[PDB]
Amino acid sequence: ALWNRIFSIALFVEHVLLGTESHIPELSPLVTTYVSLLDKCLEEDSNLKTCRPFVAVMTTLCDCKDKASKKFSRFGIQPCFICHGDAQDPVCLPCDHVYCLRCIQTWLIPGQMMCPYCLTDLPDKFSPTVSQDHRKAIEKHAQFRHMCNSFFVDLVSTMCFKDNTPPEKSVIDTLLSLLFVQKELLHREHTKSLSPFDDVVDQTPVIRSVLLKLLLKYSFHEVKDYIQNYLTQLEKKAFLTEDKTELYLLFISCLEDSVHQKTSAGCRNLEQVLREEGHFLRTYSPGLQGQEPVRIASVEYLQEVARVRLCLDLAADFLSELQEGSELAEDKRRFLKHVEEFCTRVNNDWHRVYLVRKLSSQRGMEFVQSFSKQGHPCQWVFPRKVIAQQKDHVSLMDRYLVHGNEYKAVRDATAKAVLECKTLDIGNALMACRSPKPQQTAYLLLALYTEVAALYRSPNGSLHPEAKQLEAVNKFIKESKILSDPNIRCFARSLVDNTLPLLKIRSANSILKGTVTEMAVHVATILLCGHNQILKPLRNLAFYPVNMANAFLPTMPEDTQTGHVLGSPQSSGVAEVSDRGQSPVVFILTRLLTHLAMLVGATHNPQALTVIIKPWVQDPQGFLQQHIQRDLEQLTKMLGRSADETIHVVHLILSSLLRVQSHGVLNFNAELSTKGCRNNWEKHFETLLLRELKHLDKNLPAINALISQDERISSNPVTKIIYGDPATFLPHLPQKSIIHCSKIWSCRRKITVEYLQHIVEQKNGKETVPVLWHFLQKEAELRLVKFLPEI
Ligand SMILES: [Zn+2]
Ligand SMILES: [Zn+2]
């Protein structure tokens, strides 16, 4: 009792009183009074999980607020009567009412020369605006209202929802009531952001989820009706005639996050979870005719949907490691048998759509297309027509469409000029192309890679182009002066004659080696075609690896160990915390491009990369390729993306190192002979990486549009049930329901710690959340102070 009282008063002091002393010191004798008034209203019973003290604290905070407003600006700072919010560019009438300037110019200009509220005329014009008295009064009132809101929401989050038992019905109904505001005059039925106050009100109904995430920390069996009341209120006043997909999607997301919390913080193993969910799946009657006239989707139905999504997520996680390797622990096997029997019995193909999307979001499209074979024992995950509508010539995603619509022209001309044997169309696509000679040469080299070396990859198209199709290609390569550079057309011939020793990269995964091969060819093309001072060191890791022994490679440890001082990538260590001044994404991107240039170098001569890499004696290609694998896994963890989008990020960053021929990048040696040249490299390259990562949130959907609507991937139905297209070309799925659209059965991201570290780094966390920033920087090392008293 006494500590709940002391802690509530401490929340008030911390959020209101110290903010008043720091920012607006005209209200400190008011808030020091209301400390004592909170103490006296909590000394009877400081049990904020009940109704009476919670209403008492809320009333004390409300009259603290309005006495502060009357202390500011002469008996009643009020919101604008027209826009129902804070007055922007304030204008005060002689009837002591403050309005917005835009509201009083959009209202008073017809023949209604009066006041909207107190019906009092204004003679001449609303000419003076007050930028000193009323503007500062409204701003300081906004600050004090924000302090009181921070106190109230922190008090509700900490005291009302403290322990494992839920609070009473009256306090929860009070909270759900104060999500909404009353009607004043017609617009009505507004919303507000969990405040005891009424003046800060948005004009369009937004739907927060703070009380869902606070109520769902209890068991769902005892908070059904509260969420159903909140949903019924939202459906009867706010979104009564709308597209109610996103509201349902917010509720499904909150419910599945609550189940993630109660299985993570709960103490039960995988075996009990698999038994409980397997019992759930083999008794799930569909009942979709029960709640869908159009609009009724209760919270029991949404909870069954969220629980089905979690069963399918466990199925996706099991299938992503079943086909990684060996046997699958005999409980995961039985659970996948239950998921298969579930998808067979229940005739909803949206579960299989979500399962395909989730396997592709974890692994990629090629891994999922490997399940669509003629007897692969994971073929049940597809819906019914996707197996029959595929051909025997599934093609890979062209990830060089990052360049886009000038690469598209050259790859189409190259494809037709290897299809027939007429290589004038490549010259027509290049001469009608902007983005000058470095970019055009890179487009031509990547097109030659894509078409000709992807013909050598397949067992159908290999040993085919040697029959009089490579002769016109070789004649164009010898003839064309857009690649008249003897280090470039030697590379072009090595792509076409299949003599480039990157293409024999020799890995055992056969999905990853395609990714690493495409990235290494992209790196080698950028380092040949790009003319930039920030490509000269990596160039000597790739094309002249003997110059670059006794040289400090980027993202290496420093106290000093020149060369490549990293051990085996198959270690059990901490996750290689970032450099002297770098965020972990920029760190892993710099390390990944260094390793890709080193792989391109070690494919030419492995001896110079043996004398660069310090410990072993055996081989550099598999070593560097395992490092590239680990870097891609860490980059997938950090960026909250799918696998394919992370690879698009890498290819986009590689593309951006070519168009950036502005030179502000001097003052380091091209050999990187010192620490200082390496660190200046780090700085300029971090500048390019941050320019490209500030801007990728809008480039990623355009790149996914170019790669999804490529007319060699687009007709594939796996692509049409993953990328940007609903699965409603399939007829055998439920009709236009509110609950069975493509948006509800889409995949989302599991929220990791590295993703939150990435958000802290995006949102300037050194200066905004510095304890959290320092915590996330050293988190994997701080897991192990737990073992200090044992050692
Ligand atoms: Zn207004
Ligand atoms: Zn008035």
Side-chain angles (χ1 to χ4, degrees), residues 97-318:
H97 293 168
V98 54
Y99 289 157
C100 295
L101 186 63
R102 62 176 180 87
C103 292
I104 201 63
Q105 68 90 29
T106 194
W107 185 77
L108 190 62
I109 52 171
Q112 55 183 358
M113 188 67 73
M114 65 190 294
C115 179
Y117 182 73
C118 69
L119 307 177
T120 303
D121 295 332
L122 193 147
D124 197 3
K125 193 174 174 66
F126 53 95
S127 297
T129 182
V130 180
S131 178
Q132 295 299 110
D133 292 332
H134 292 283
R135 187 260 182 192
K136 292 298 291 182
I138 292 168
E139 178 66 31
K140 293 187 287 185
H141 180 72
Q143 290 183 358
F144 187 74
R145 184 180 60 237
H146 183 269
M147 296 175 191
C148 294
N149 284 321
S150 295
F151 163 66
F152 178 73
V153 177
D154 199 2
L155 186 71
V156 171
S157 298
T158 307
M159 290 291 105
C160 294
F161 294 105
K162 192 175 181 181
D163 54 354
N164 292 321
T165 60
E168 290 181 354
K169 185 180 177 180
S170 298
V171 52
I172 290 173
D173 289 332
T174 301
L175 292 166
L176 269 67
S177 68
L178 64 91
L179 282 174
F180 301 99
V181 80
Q182 76 272 14
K183 60 182 180 181
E184 293 184 355
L185 189 63
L186 78 159
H187 193 197
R188 302 178 186 271
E189 67 265 8
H190 303 281
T191 56
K192 66 183 176 67
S193 66
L194 192 66
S195 182
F197 302 152
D198 288 328
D199 49 351
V200 47
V201 159
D202 48 357
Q203 69 272 17
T204 60
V206 79
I207 295 172
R208 268 59 166 253
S209 71
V210 288
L211 286 187
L212 292 178
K213 304 297 284 293
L214 287 173
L215 284 174
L216 266 317
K217 69 185 287 185
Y218 306 112
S219 69
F220 180 76
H221 186 273
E222 63 193 1
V223 294
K224 286 187 285 185
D225 296 330
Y226 301 147
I227 302 166
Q228 181 61 49
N229 288 319
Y230 176 55
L231 183 57
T232 305
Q233 289 177 357
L234 288 180
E235 289 175 352
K236 75 179 290 294
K237 66 178 73 173
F239 285 180
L240 78 162
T241 170
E242 291 297 325
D243 193 0
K244 291 191 285 187
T245 298
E246 298 294 328
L247 172 144
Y248 288 156
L249 189 61
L250 181 143
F251 283 25
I252 289 167
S253 296
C254 291
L255 287 163
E256 66 186 359
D257 290 334
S258 71
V259 182
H260 283 299
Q261 294 174 359
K262 293 188 285 185
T263 59
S264 296
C267 294
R268 79 283 304 277
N269 54 0
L270 186 62
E271 195 270 335
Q272 183 66 40
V273 171
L274 289 179
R275 281 184 291 173
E276 187 179 2
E277 301 301 323
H279 187 274
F280 169 66
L281 291 175
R282 67 179 182 269
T283 59
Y284 184 84
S285 66
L288 57 90
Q289 295 296 111
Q291 294 85 17
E292 195 262 329
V294 47
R295 66 178 66 249
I296 291 95
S298 67
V299 184
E300 292 87 3
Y301 189 76
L302 294 174
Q303 195 269 332
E304 290 179 354
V305 165
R307 191 171 178 180
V308 166
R309 290 174 66 97
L310 293 172
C311 296
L312 297 178
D313 289 334
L314 290 174
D317 290 330
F318 292 164

Side-chain angles (χ1 to χ4, degrees), residues 19 45 69 147 194 495 533 690:
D45 193 1
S69 67
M147 296 175 191
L194 192 66
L495 289 172
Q533 183 65 39
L690 290 175

Side-chain angles (χ1 to χ4, degrees), residues 64-110:
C64 176
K65 191 262 291 180
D66 69 2
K67 287 176 72 173
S69 67
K70 294 180 181 178
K71 191 174 291 294
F72 282 120
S73 178
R74 190 182 177 272
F75 293 162
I77 283 295
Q78 295 298 110
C80 179
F81 186 73
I82 296 170
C83 71
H84 200 280
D86 285 331
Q88 299 301 111
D89 293 331
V91 54
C92 59
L93 274 71
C95 61
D96 200 1
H97 293 168
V98 54
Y99 289 157
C100 295
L101 186 63
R102 62 176 180 87
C103 292
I104 201 63
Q105 68 90 29
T106 194
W107 185 77
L108 190 62
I109 52 171

